[PDB]
Design a protein around this ligand. Structure first.
Ligand SMILES: *Cc1c(COP(=O)(O)O)cnc(C)c1O
Ligand SMILES: *Cc1c(COP(=O)(O)O)cnc(C)c1O
Ligand SMILES: N=C(N)[C@@H](/N=N/c1ccccc1)C(N)=O
Ligand SMILES: N=C(N)[C@@H](/N=N/c1ccccc1)C(N)=O
Ligand SMILES: [Cl-]
Ligand SMILES: [Cl-]
Ligand SMILES: [Cl-]
Ligand SMILES: [Cl-]
Ligand SMILES: [Cl-]
Ligand SMILES: [Cl-]
Ligand SMILES: [Cl-]
Ligand SMILES: [Cl-]
Ligand SMILES: [Cl-]
Ligand SMILES: [Cl-]
Ligand SMILES: [Cl-]
Ligand SMILES: [Cl-]
Ligand SMILES: [Cl-]
Ligand SMILES: [Cl-]
Ligand SMILES: [Cl-]
Ligand SMILES: [Cl-]
Ligand SMILES: [Cl-]
Ligand SMILES: [Cl-]
Ligand SMILES: [Cl-]
Ligand SMILES: [Cl-]
Ligand SMILES: [Cl-]
Ligand SMILES: [Cl-]
Ligand SMILES: [Cl-]
Ligand SMILES: [Cl-]
Ligand SMILES: [Cl-]
Ligand SMILES: [Cl-]
Ligand SMILES: [Cl-]
Ligand SMILES: [Cl-]
Ligand SMILES: [Cs+]
Ligand SMILES: [Cs+]
Ligand SMILES: [Cs+]
Ligand SMILES: [Cs+]
Lengths: 396, 258, 396, 258
C-alpha cells in the first residue's frame, strides 16, 4: 500500500523486485512527512538560495526575436550552481537521505552530469557518495570522473555485462537492495518507480513557480507557452508543474529527434516509442518488435534515454501538454544563434527547447506570442562536440 | 501448475526435497542449452527454472548478467526461447517448467497472449522478476486463466502483510530468499497461511545447503546461479561442461533425499 | 585637464601618447555623466540582474571551518553569467560605449577569459567586437578562441613582435588610437591610465555593496576581513570599495607567489616589485635592475600580470589594505579543499584568496573571526591544469 | 638644445629644411648600428632621432616593434645605448642628437639622473613617447636643468589649449604628426605661439613628402620608420644595407634644399 497514487493515469507504478518495495515505501513516507515539515522546507530553501543561487534570472531575449511578434524569455537554470537544474533536486534528495538517517548516497552516471550533481550535494551535506560508472564511460569522461573524485565521491568502474550505463545502474540498484538502511539511491530524473517521479517534480517545481512570479511582474500576464527539453523529464516537469492548472498556458516538451525520427536514431519515445515496463515504471519506451529496450540517440548525452517520465506520458494522453521533436541540426543552429545574438552558450539539451521556440517564431512571425524557454543548462561542456561537427562539415 | 502439485505429493511420499536448477535459455547457444537442460534432468533435477534473455535484466547478479549476454551474443530471441520450451516439454512430460521473466517481455504483445503462449508450450509457472505483489493483479489473473502458477518472492525483509499476500496469491511454489525475521518463522508462517510449498533460493551452491533447506521445513532448494557458473567455467569444453553439470546436479539432488 | 584626480596618492596617472588623451578625456566625461544619470544606472542594474543574475549568493562554509572559531562566507561571483566577476564591468563599459555613440569594442586577451567576457557583452548589446590575440596564444587557447568566435567576435591573430599578449595589446591600442570615434577599448582590470582604474572599481563595487548587506542580514555585523585575489585588481577593489570607510574591516589582497617569492617566479609586484611607469600608469611592477618589465608567473593565468592597479598600491601605502602572497601549492590545496568539503570547484585565481583565509583560520584556530572570501570565479576551466599537476606528482 | 638652435639658424640662412632619420640603437647589433648612424650622417642627415630598446614599446608601429626585437636579440641594454651615444657625439660635434624614450627607462634610476646622463654623453633632446604634456612636468624640468630639449608631439587631434602648451613647454623642435585641423593652421598657430620649429613626422618615406613639409612651412621632416624598413630589408647584406641607406638619405636630404 502507498500514501500517494503511484500512477499518472495508466503510467508509472512500482515495477521493482519485491526486495526493493520497503525502500520505496520508506522514501515515500519520508517525502510525505518532509512536505508537511516547515523545518525541512526552510533548510531546502536555505540551500537553494545561499548555496545554489536561487532565484535564477528570467532573461528577455530581444536580439533573437527582433522583427517578429514573439517575446521570448529564458529561465536561467544555466546560472544555478553546477550549471544546470539537476542541482535543485539532488539537494532535496540529499536532505531526504539525512531525514531518513542515511550517511551514504548511491548514484550511477554515463556522461557524468548527474554524477557531478550527486557528488556536489554529497560533499556539501557530509554524505559518503558512491557513483557506479561503466568502465567504457570512465574511459570517455575523464573530466566528469575527475570532478566527481575532486568532490570526494568514490567512482566505481563496472566491467560486468556490457561495461556501460545499464551495467552501472544494475550494480547501483544491487548495492541499494542491500544498503538501503544506510544509503539513499539518488535518481537523476522524473522517472523510475514511485515515488521518484513525484519527488523529482516537487524538488524542481520552483523553476515554474519563479517563472510565473517573474513573468507576472515583467509582463502582467501568464505566458502563452512554456517550452522545455525532455530527456527523462525533470527540468520540463519542474517548469510545467505550477502552470498545470493554468489551462491557457501551453506546455511544450521537446524530445531529441537525433538524425531524424524516420532514421530510428532519436530519443523520442513519448511520440515515437510505445508503452512498456522497464526501470520500475510503465511508460513510453523505444523497443524492438519483440520487447527488447532499444538504444536511443541524440547529439546531446543529457537527452539520450529511450524512455520518459510517466507524468509526461499522462499529460500528453489527456492533451494537457504537447510533445514535439527537434533534430541534432536544429539544436546546433539554436546553440549558434543564442551564442551570437545573446552572448549565452546554452547546453545542447536546452538548445532543443530553444530550437522549437525559434521554429514557433519563424513559422508564424506575425503571431503575437509570449514564450518562456527553460534554459536547463550552460553549454561550456558541449563546445568540443560543437567544434568537431562544425569543422567536419566545412564550418557550416 | 498441476505438475508442481503432483511433484510435491510424490516428493512428500518419499520424505524428499525438490532440487531445482536455474539456467538462461540459449546460454551459450540454442543447441548446447537444449543439451545442458536434458543433462540437468537426467542428473535428477525435480523441476526447472528457465530465464528468457532480456536487454536490461536489472534484478540479476553478475553470473546471470553474463549468461544473458552470451545468449544475446548467440542472437537468442523470445520466439526461439518459446520454440525451445515446446521441445523441452515434448521430451519430458511431467517435470515442472518455470520461467523467470521481466515484465516488458510479458507485457510486450499483451499480458494475456504471453500466458496463452506459456500454456500452449507446456510451461507450469512464471516468476516476473520486476513485478512485486502490489503490481501483480493482471499477471496473476492472466497466469491463472491459462493454468500457469504465478510465483512470488518472499524476501528476507518480508512482514506479516507480505507473507499473507504471497500465501494467498502464489501457486506452484513460494520462492523464498532468506538472504530480517528468522528462516524458521517464515517457513512456519507460510505453512500456517497455506502458501504454495517454499523453495529456498538464497545462496544454494552446495549439498549441505540443500539438506539445511529441507531440515528447516522448506520443500526444496533452487540453485539460482551455481549451474550458470559451471557453464561460464567450461565454455571451451562443452563435453566437460555437461560432465561437471551432471556431477553437480547428482550431488545436489542426493542431498535432498531421505 | 580632467574632471577627476587621475592619481591615488603618487600612483596612477595617464602615461599615454598625446594622441590617446582625447579618447581618455572623452571616456572620463561619459563616465562622470553616466554616474549622475538614473537611466544609465537603471539600464546597468537591469543587465546585472536579469542577464548576469545579480545578486550573487553569499555562502556560509561550515565543513571547511569545523572545530575552529572562524566563520567563513564565500561571495559567489562564480555564479555570475560567464562564471567570473569580469562580466559586471564589461556590461558597464559596453553601456558606456553605447552612451558615447560607439558601435565597436576593442579588447585583447592571452588566456581568453577577458576576451570571452568582452565578446558576450558585445553580442548582447549589438556591438561589433574585435579581440587581438597573440598567434602563440590563439594556438594554446582553442576553447576560448572558439567561445569568442561563437559569440560573433572577430579574433585577430597578431604575428608582430613576440606574437603574444604585449603584441596583441600594442595592436589593440594602435587600432584604438585611430578608431576611438567609433570604437571603445574595453580594459579588463582596475589598471591602466585614468579613468580605467576608477571606472572598473565603480562597475565592480556591487560585489562589496551586496556582501555588506548580506553579512549584516546574516550576522548583524560587518566582517573582520574581506579577502580577494589580486591579478590587476578588479575583483579585489570591487569587494573592497564599499568597506573602505568601515575602518574596522580588514581588506586583504592576495597576489600570486608562484613557485615562491624567493624564486623570482611570481606575480607579486605590489609587495615584491618596485614602482615604474608602464601600461599608462605609475604603479608597482616586476622589473630588471635597468627598468625592463619582467615576465610574471603563476599557476593561474588570470593572476599572471607583472603590475597591479594603482588604487591597491595607494591603499597599501597608507596602511588601509594589507597585501600577502599565496604559492601555487597553497592555491592547489585550497582548490582541492573547497571541492571536497563544499562541492564548489573554485577558479585557481580565487583559490589564492581561499588559501590565505584557510591560513588565517589554521594558524590561529581559537581566534574568533568572521571572514569573507571573494570567490571571483568557477574552476571548470582549471581541471586539466590541476589534473596534470596531480598525476605528475603521483596523485599528491 | 643649443645644437638645434644653431642647426635651424644655419638651415634658415640656406632656405633649407632639416632631414632627420630615426633608428633604434643596436639594431641589428651594436657595431652595425654605429656604422648605420655614421652612414646616415655622411649621407646628409641634419640631426638624429635614436630609440633605446624597451621591453614593452606600446607607442611604435610594426617596423619599429621588429627593430626593437632585433636589438633585444643582440642583447642591447640602456647602458650600452649610452656608451654608443657617447661614441656618436665624440665623432660628430655639432649634429643634434635626440632620444625617443619610454617613461620607465627615464624613471627607472631617477628622472633627474637620466637627464644628467643624457647631458654627460652629449644628447640634445628627449621625446618620452608615453608622457603627454599633462604628465610632463618632472620630465621637462629635469630636461631643462641638464640643458636637454623636451620634445612634444602635436598630434592631428590637437586643440588650441594643446598648441599653446606644446608651444610653451617644448624646445629644440615640435614633433608634428599630421596623421583634425589643417596642416597650414597647425604650423601657422605653432609659429604664432613661438613654438620650437616644427618637424613633420607623419608618413615621411619619399623625397616629395620632405619638399611638401618644407613648402607647408615646417622646418623639416622626420623619417620615423622608412630608414628601419631599409635595415629590416637588408639584414643578410650589411654592405648593401649601408648603400641603400646612403642613397635613401641623400635623396631625402636633396629634397629639403632650396
Ligand atoms: C540532465 C539534463 C537534462 C535532461 O534531463 P531532464 O531530467 O529531462 O531535465 C536537460 N538539460 C540539461 C542541461 C541537463 O543537465
Ligand atoms: C580575471 C580574473 C581574476 C583576476 O583579475 P582581477 O582584475 O585582479 O580581479 C581573478 N579571478 C578570476 C576568476 C578572474 O576571471
Ligand atoms: N532493482 C531492480 N532490479 C529494479 N529497479 N529498481 C529501481 C529502484 C529504484 C530506482 C530505479 C529502479 C527493476 N528490475 O526495475
Ligand atoms: N597606446 C600606447 N602606446 C600607450 N597605452 N595606452 C593605453 C591606453 C588605454 C588603455 C591602456 C593603455 C602606452 N605607451 O602606455
Ligand atoms: Cl492515462
Ligand atoms: Cl516534522
Ligand atoms: Cl563525507
Ligand atoms: Cl553491487
Ligand atoms: Cl540521469
Ligand atoms: Cl503566490
Ligand atoms: Cl506582488
Ligand atoms: Cl515535432
Ligand atoms: Cl536478441
Ligand atoms: Cl519428466
Ligand atoms: Cl530473482
Ligand atoms: Cl490477502
Ligand atoms: Cl496458495
Ligand atoms: Cl532464480
Ligand atoms: Cl601615495
Ligand atoms: Cl543624463
Ligand atoms: Cl553585432
Ligand atoms: Cl592595428
Ligand atoms: Cl585582462
Ligand atoms: Cl544602504
Ligand atoms: Cl533592512
Ligand atoms: Cl605573504
Ligand atoms: Cl636586453
Ligand atoms: Cl656634426
Ligand atoms: Cl612616436
Ligand atoms: Cl601654457
Ligand atoms: Cl619654445
Ligand atoms: Cl620617430
Ligand atoms: Cs520581438
Ligand atoms: Cs528521451
Ligand atoms: Cs566554525
Ligand atoms: Cs599580479
Amino acid at each position: 500500500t502507498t500514501l500517494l497514487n503511484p500512477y499518472f493515469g495508466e503510467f508509472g507504478g512500482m515495477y521493482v523486485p519485491q526486495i526493493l518495495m520497503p525502500a520505496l515505501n520508506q522514501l515515500e513516507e519520508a517525502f510525505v512527512s518532509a512536505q508537511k515539515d516547515p523545518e525541512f522546507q526552510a533548510q531546502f530553501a536555505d540551500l537553494l538560495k545561499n548555496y545554489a543561487g536561487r532565484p535564477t534570472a528570467l532573461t528577455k531575449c530581444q536580439n533573437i526575436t527582433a522583427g517578429t511578434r514573439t517575446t521570448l524569455y529564458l529561465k536561467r537554470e544555466d546560472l544555478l550552481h553546477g550549471g544546470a537544474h539537476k542541482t535543485n533536486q539532488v539537494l532535496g534528495q540529499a536532505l531526504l537521505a539525512k531525514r531518513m538517517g542515511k550517511s551514504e548516497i548511491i548514484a550511477e552516471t554515463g556522461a557524468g552530469q548527474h554524477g557531478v550533481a550527486s557528488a556536489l550535494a554529497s560533499a556539501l551535506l557530509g554524505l559518503k557518495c558512491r557513483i557506479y560508472m561503466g568502465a567504457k564511460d570512465v574511459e570517455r569522461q575523464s573530466p566528469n570522473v575527475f570532478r566527481m573524485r575532486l568532490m570526494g565521491a568514490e567512482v566505481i568502474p563496472v566491467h560486468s555485462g556490457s561495461a556501460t550505463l545499464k551495467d552501472a545502474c544494475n550494480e547501483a540498484l544491487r548495492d541499494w537492495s542491500g544498503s538501503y538502511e544506510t544509503a539513499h539511491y539518488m535518481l537523476g530524473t522524473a522517472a523510475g518507480p514511485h515515488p521518484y517521479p513525484t519527488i523529482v517534480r516537487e524538488f524542481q517545481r520552483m523553476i515554474g513557480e519563479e517563472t510565473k512570479a517573474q513573468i507576472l511582474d515583467k509582463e502582467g500576464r501568464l505566458p502563452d507557452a512554456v517550452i522545455a527539453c525532455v530527456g527523462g523529464g525533470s527540468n520540463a516537469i519542474g517548469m510545467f508543474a505550477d502552470f498545470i492548472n493554468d489551462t491557457s498556458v501551453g506546455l511544450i516538451g521537446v524530445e531529441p529527434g537525433g538524425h531524424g525520427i524516420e532514421t530510428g536514431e532519436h530519443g523520442a519515445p513519448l511520440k515515437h516509442g510505445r508503452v512498456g515496463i522497464y526501470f520500475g515504471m510503465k511508460a513510453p519506451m523505444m523497443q524492438t518488435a519483440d520487447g527488447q529496450i532499444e538504444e536511443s540517440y541524440s547529439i546531446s548525452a543529457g537527452l539520450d534515454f529511450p524512455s520518459v517520465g510517466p507524468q509526461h506520458a499522462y499529460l500528453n494522453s489527456i492533451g494537457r501538454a504537447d510533445y514535439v521533436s527537434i533534430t541534432d541540426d536544429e539544436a546546433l543552429e539554436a546553440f549558434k544563434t543564442l551564442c551570437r545574438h545573446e552572448g549565452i552558450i546554452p547546453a545542447l539539451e536546452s538548445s532543443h527547447a530553444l530550437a522549437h521556440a525559434l521554429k514557433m517564431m519563424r513559422e508564424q512571425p506575425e503571431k503575437e506570442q509570449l514564450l518562456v524557454v527553460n534554459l536547463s543548462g550552460r553549454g561550456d561542456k558541449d563546445i568540443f562536440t560543437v567544434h568537431d561537427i562544425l569543422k567536419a562539415r566545412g564550418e557550416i | 501448475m498441476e505438475r508442481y502439485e503432483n511433484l510435491f505429493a510424490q516428493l512428500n511420499d518419499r520424505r524428499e526435497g525438490a532440487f531445482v536448477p536455474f539456467v538462461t535459455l540459449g546460454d551459450p547457444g540454442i543447441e548446447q542449452s537444449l543439451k545442458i537442460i536434458d543433462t540437468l534432468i537426467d542428473a535428477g533435477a525435480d523441476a526447472l527454472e528457465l530465464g528468457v534473455p532480456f536487454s536490461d535484466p536489472l534484478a540479476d547478479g553478475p553470473t546471470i548478467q553474463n549468461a544473458n549476454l552470451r545468449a544475446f551474443a548467440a542472437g537468442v530471441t523470445p520466439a526461439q526461447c518459446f520454440e525451445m520450451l515446446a521441445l523441452i516439454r515434448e521430451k519430458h512430460p511431467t517435470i515442472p517448467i518455470g520461467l523467470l521473466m521481466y515484465a516488458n517481455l510479458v507485457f510486450n504483445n499483451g499480458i494475456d497472449a504471453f500466458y496463452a503462449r506459456c500454456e500452449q508450450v507446456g510451461v507450469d509457472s512464471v516468476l516476473v522478476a520486476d513485478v512485486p505483489v502490489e503490481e501483480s493483479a493482471p499477471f496473476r489473473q492472466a497466469a491463472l486463466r491459462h493454468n500457469i502458477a504465478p510465483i512470488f518472492i518472499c524476501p528476507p525483509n518480508a512482514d506479516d502483510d507480505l507473507l499473507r499476500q504471497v500465501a494467498s496469491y502464489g501457486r506452484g511454489y513460494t520462492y523464498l530468499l532468506s538472504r530480517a525475521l528468522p528462516l524458521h518463522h517464515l517457513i512456519e508462517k507460510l505453512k500456517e497461511y497455506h502458501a504454495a510449498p517454499a523453495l529456498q533460493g538464497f545462496g544454494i551452491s552446495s549439498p549441505e545447503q540443500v539438506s539445511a533447506a529441507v531440515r528447516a521445513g522448506a520443500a526444496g532448494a533452487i540453485s539460482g546461479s551455481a549451474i550458470v557458473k559451471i557453464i561460464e567455467k567450461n565454455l571451451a569444453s562443452p563435453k566437460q561442461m555437461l560432465a561437471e553439470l551432471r556431477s553437480f546436479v547428482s550431488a545436489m539432488k542426493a542431498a535432498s533425499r531421505a
